[PDB]
Write a protein that binds this ligand. Structure first.
Ligand SMILES: Nc1ncnc2[nH]cnc12
Lengths: 39, 113
């Protein structure tokens, strides 16, 4: 059974996965103010 | 990696005449680029948003490109911050934009650290 340390590694992996999920074009567009051109 | 790390990088002190290919050469060196938005108004020119597909590439670009020399000019490379991003709105309309983003997508709406 995972030790406290292995749990913390497992937790970082989960947190890191949530921060590296693919974004819709709709989500992405919502992030930005006016005056920018998509290349 | 610290909470402020983000796949969206906000760039300042960007030359006005830099091309789409130059932008992809500079930033693409660090990993697959999701998209790039270049400022093209009086208030936004000289600035850009650079999005990575992967967060560890974005971290790597920050570590390496802050103060990067392109055409006698040193880039400022910062992690996206939604508060910052919507500065140029008025009190009431900003608060609603940030509310929308936190509610619909769960992004942090606090000012930088
Ligand atoms: N860190 C930042 N992220 C997004 N837009 C910005 N405008 C100014 N600072 C910013």
């Amino acid at each position: 059974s995972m030790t406290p340390e292995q749990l913390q590694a497992w937790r970082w992996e989960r947190e890191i996965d949530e921060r590296n999920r693919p974004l819709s074009d709709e989500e992405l567009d919502a992030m930005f103010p006016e005056g920018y051109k998509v290349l | 990696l610290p909470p402020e790390v983000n796949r969206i990088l906000y760039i300042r002190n960007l030359p006005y005449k830099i091309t789409a290919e130059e932008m992809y050469d500079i930033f693409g060196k660090y990993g697959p680029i999701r998209q790039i938005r270049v400022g093209n108004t009086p208030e936004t020119r000289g600035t850009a948003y650079v999005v990575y597909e992967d967060i560890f590439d974005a971290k790597n670009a920050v570590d390496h490109l802050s103060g990067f020399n392109v055409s006698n000019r040193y880039l400022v490379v910062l992690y996206y911050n939604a508060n910052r991003a919507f500065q140029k709105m008025d009190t009431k309309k900003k608060e609603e934009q940030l509310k929308l983003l936190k509610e619909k997508y769960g992004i942090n709406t606090d000012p930088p650290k």
